[PDB]
Amino acid sequence: MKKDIHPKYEEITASCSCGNVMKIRSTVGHDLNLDVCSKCHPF
Amino acid sequence: DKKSARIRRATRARRKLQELGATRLVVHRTPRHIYAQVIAPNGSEVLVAASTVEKAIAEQLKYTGNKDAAAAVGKAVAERALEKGIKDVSFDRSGFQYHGRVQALADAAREAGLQF
Amino acid sequence: MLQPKRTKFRKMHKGRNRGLAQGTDVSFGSFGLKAVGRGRLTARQIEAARRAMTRAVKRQGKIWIRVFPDKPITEKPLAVRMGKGKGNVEYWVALIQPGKVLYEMDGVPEELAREAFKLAAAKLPIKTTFVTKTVM
Amino acid sequence: AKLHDYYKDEVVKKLMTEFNYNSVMQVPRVEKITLNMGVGEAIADKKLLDNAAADLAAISGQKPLITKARKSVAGFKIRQGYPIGCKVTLRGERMWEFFERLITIAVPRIRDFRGLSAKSFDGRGNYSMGVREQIIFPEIDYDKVDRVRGLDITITTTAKSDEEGRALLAAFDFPFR
Amino acid sequence: RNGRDSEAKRLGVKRFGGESVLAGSIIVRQRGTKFHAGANVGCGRDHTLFAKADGKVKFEVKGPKNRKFISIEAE
Amino acid sequence: GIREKIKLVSSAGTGHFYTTTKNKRTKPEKLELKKFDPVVRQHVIYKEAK
RNA sequence: CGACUUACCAACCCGAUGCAAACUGCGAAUACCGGAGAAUGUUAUCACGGGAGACACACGGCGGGUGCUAACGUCCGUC
RNA sequence: UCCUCCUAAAGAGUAACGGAGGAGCACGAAGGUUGGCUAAUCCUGGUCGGACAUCAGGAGGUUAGUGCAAUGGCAUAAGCCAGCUUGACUGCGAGCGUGACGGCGCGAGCAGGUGCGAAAGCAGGUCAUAGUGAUCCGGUGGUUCUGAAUGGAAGGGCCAUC
RNA sequence: UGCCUGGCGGCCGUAGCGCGGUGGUCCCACCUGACCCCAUGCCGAACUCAGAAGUGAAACGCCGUAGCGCCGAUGGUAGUGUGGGGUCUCCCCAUGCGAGAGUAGGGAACUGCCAGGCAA
């Protein structure tokens, strides 16, 4: 894995409106707010 | 294919040594039991071989297929070649990068008398 | 007026007509016209012979042409001295060796087939004979 | 990584029972995922390539590489060796977390959603699809980007045919409408 | 608009199979490598094959592609 | 024949020089190859000149 | 957004038939190069020296280009 | 004038105001070495994207590519990518090819000093074959070689080059 | 000595493709992890290191099958050197050499050195 060439991949906790919370490592930033997820959605 | 890529990689070196007409030290590497062989210029007979597959050399090193194993095999080929009489040889990578176990085997061999 | 399309070269050497024909057997129809003599057939001659048979058979049956010109022939213009390069292409000819099958035909009676081929051979510059499809 | 444990926990057994294979490795398994972005408009403005690469780094966990034209074609005014797109291939562990983000936060956020397609198979077991806009992924704030360009996704597995690939994907609760 | 040609380069085999040659003598002159150098035979920059040792020249076919080789044996 | 001929002068005091060609339109900067000087029998830096 | 037929145009392929100086997945006879051997030939061979002439060729056979598979035509190869 | 194919008759060579095409360069890298890689064309899925951009898989085995026309060659790649570099080096050169000659071409090996590689080794430009002009006269730099009474110098010679 | 396995060759399509079966005691492959050695013009993909859980799925080796590729006669034919002849822009005779394609058929290899396991 090359160094100082990739974006930061820090962990962050995200929760949606329907009460589902999960931890994901991404580049979103500081905080995230969601309304729908895999479940609790009219898919 | 891993084998096809490796053979293609080593073909030029093998041909160069073949036309040069000199005894060559050929090493075969796998996830376990690194091998080594000495081949006559004609390529038809094996002067001497060593490896960690035989109990005579596999009864000391903790695990076969590491840096320590390469040094043992590299050393093992040395005194065998010196005892046989042949001194100068040409190292053959056989398509294996000369970085880790292959380098360790060669380093052990060269410091043990088989200068090349 | 049979003629190739976008041939590789405009002109080619005269060559020679030695040898022996290859397509010596009927392969498509049941009757055919075999070449006895040796020579070359122009595109005009092939067209004239083809028209003669089609009229003779009254557009009944099938007609196969087993020869293609695929060979340009040049001719110097009148009142032109020798030299100054190869002449311009004028017409296309097909080299014919003995035994070559010129035309093949099927779907008509043998009796009507003989006269149709006889009319065509009358408009060709090489001795020809009538042949029938052989069993193997 | 969590679904990788989920895959190793009973999905392999689910694959085992349904296809009653002889061995365990016979079950299909994903090995890598690939992201493509055929921008195409590098000729009009090559400056946008860098930012077009940047967002893919936002969705992905690593730096993309810019692909160059295989050959020059007069119908597109593109010369050989000219960058006209970028791609990303992710495997190992990082693919799993991205697969989570796609299957949990991305698919539901599709504008005018109707259902994930089930006929998008190459005929050997590899799945491909595309997206209209970037805001589906959370890494876009709607104010730092002003482009409508989309991207393509493609997941490749060791399936020998579509039937096991579709069955394997179904085990991952794919919509397949 | 024709009439142009190039001076002939006099290529071809200079020494044929079964005749002794001296070291450094030209065996084959060729544009490409129709014949490949074998034993005691060297290849020049223009693909010329010359003898690197004194002996008898022989031709043979070897390799998976059945490509022709020229060798020299010290006889 | 846009390519024009230049002279490479040894950095040593010896007057030996090499002659070559270069394209000033594309590569206008000087040439600093390291070549062998037989007067001193050493490899030295050669500078471009007229 | 499913999808279907065709009296009608037709790609790529498959089976059969041909053609090519500037096509070859095949391939002679001769010729040419090298080696060994007997007979034969006034050394017929090669190298060096003295003296030349000649450098407008023609027809015939064979293999061709050109021309009209015309020319006691013209241009090459070999006897 | 030079290069490639055919004519040219299976060694070489071989004419015509015979049939086809090209050259009067380019490149400090497109050279050297070390390490690695392997196309064209089709089929299926996929946003713009459409027969033809990019991605994934499959058939294919070089129909690709090789700075420039053609022929021969090229998987050990001579084709594609990257690191380090200047052997595109000096003095020679056994032995051959090719020419009537002037001349042109190939070249192991030796000495000196370099580059790449752990090393065996490779490198005296470029996949090869066109990219070129004798001699005279004169210019520039080096070299007591000479320098017409002597010491210098001028001018010549030799070497590199225009 | 035999069934096997790996490496280095000879030989190069009778040796290569397609279909079916077969192999984990060793060896081989896949495979877990990779902070460190090493690398991605991004990716433990590839290369490299630390391992051996699991497996014979893929690949690889072996066996069977002619469905292809491939090899291939005898005979005849074409061509052809030399010497003659003809209704001589093409052929024939005596003698020497003798294809290509196709046919019957063959055919899904053989072999040397070294190292390791099992049975001997």
Q: What is the DSSP string of A2-35?
A: -SSSS----EEEEE-TTS-EEEEESS--S--B-S
Interatomic CA distance for residues D173 and E18, integer angstroms = 78
Residue of A nearest to D94 (CA): A25
Which residue's entry shows tokens 């005749």? E19
Interatomic CA distance for residues E36 and E23, integer angstroms = 17
Resolution (Å units)? 2.4
Domain boundaries, chain F: 1-50
DSSP string, F1-50: ---EEEEEEESSSS--EEEEEE-TTT--S----EEEETTTTEEEEEEEE-
Which residues does chain D have within 8 Å of residue A7's beta carbon, measured at their own beta carbons?
A: 57-58, 61-63
Report which DSSP code applies to C23. Answer: -
DSSP string, chain E: -----------EESS-TT-EE-TT-EEEE-SS-SEEE-TTEEE-TTS-EEESSSEEEEEEEETTTTEEEEEEE--
Q: Which domain holds residue D63?
A: 1-177
Nearest Cα of chain A lies from the Cα of D131 at a distance, in angstroms, of 17
Nearest to A28 among D109, D138, D175 (CB): D138
Nearest to A37 among D108, D115, D173 (CB): D108
Q: How many domains does one find in chain D?
A: 1
Interatomic CA distance for residues E28 and D138, integer angstroms = 71
User: CA F4 → CA F28, F30, F35, F37, distances in Å?
Assistant: 12, 14, 20, 23
Chain A interface includes D57 (CB < 8 A): yes
Q: CB of D100 within 8 A of CB of A24?
A: yes
Hey, is D16 helix, strand or coil? Answer: helix
Domain boundaries, chain E: 11-75
Describe the strand order of the beta sheet including D151-157 as a list of residue ranges: D65-68, D83-91, D30-37, D151-157, D127-131
Closest alpha carbon to A28 in D137, D64, D134: D137
Bridge partners (DSSP) listed for residue D155: D33, D127
Question: And the tokens for C49?
Answer: 């012979």
Residues 52-91 of D with CB under 7 A from strand I: 62-65, 68, 87-91
D97 and A24 within 8 Å at the Cβ level: the answer is yes
| B1-116 CATH choice from 3.40.980.20, 3.30.420.100, 3.10.580.10, 3.40.630.30 | 3.30.420.100
A7 and D57 within 8 Å at the Cβ level: the answer is yes
Q: CB of D34 within 8 A of CB of D87?
A: yes
Statement: F1-50 belongs to CATH 2.20.28.120: yes
CB atoms within 10 A of CB E30: 15
Query: Which residue type is seen at B107?
Result: D
Question: Please, where are the H alpha helices in D7-93?
Answer: 12-19, 48-59
Interatomic CA distance for residues A4 and D105, integer angstroms = 28
A2 and D63 within 8 Å at the Cβ level: the answer is yes
Specify the pairing of strand A21-25 against strand A11-15.
antiparallel
**Long-range own/partner contacts, residues A10-15 (CB < 8 A, 24 or more apart):** A14/D105, A14/D138
| C21-136 CATH choice from 2.40.440.10, 3.90.1170.10, 1.10.3720.10, 1.20.20.10 | 3.90.1170.10
Hey, is D6 helix, strand or coil? Answer: helix
B74-95 burial, b for 16+ CB within 10 Å, e for fewer?
bbbbbebbeeeebeebbbbbbb
Kindly give, in sequence order, each residue whose CB lies less than 8 Å from that of residue D44, ignoring residues fewer than 6 positions away: none
Backbone angles phi, psi at A28, to 5 degrees: -60, -45
Interatomic CA distance for residues D159 and E72, integer angstroms = 56
Query: Which residue type is seen at C117?
Result: F
Q: Is the CB of D124 under 7 A from strand H?
A: yes
Bridge partners (DSSP) listed for residue C105: C31, C63
Q: What is the largest CA-CA distance in chain A?
A: 42
Q: Strand G: which bases are under 7 Å from protein Cβ?
A: 16-23, 33-35, 63-71, 73-74
The CATH number for D144's domain is 3.30.1440.10
Report which DSSP code applies to D107. Answer: G
Question: And the tokens for F25?
Answer: 């339109």
CB atoms within 10 A of CB C89: 14
- The method recorded for this entry reads cryo-EM
Question: Which chains does chain B touch, 3 or more C-beta pairs < 8 A?
Answer: none
Helices C43-57 & C110-121 angle (0-180, nearest 10): 150
Question: Please, where are the H alpha helices in chain D?
Answer: 2-6, 12-19, 48-59, 94-101, 162-171
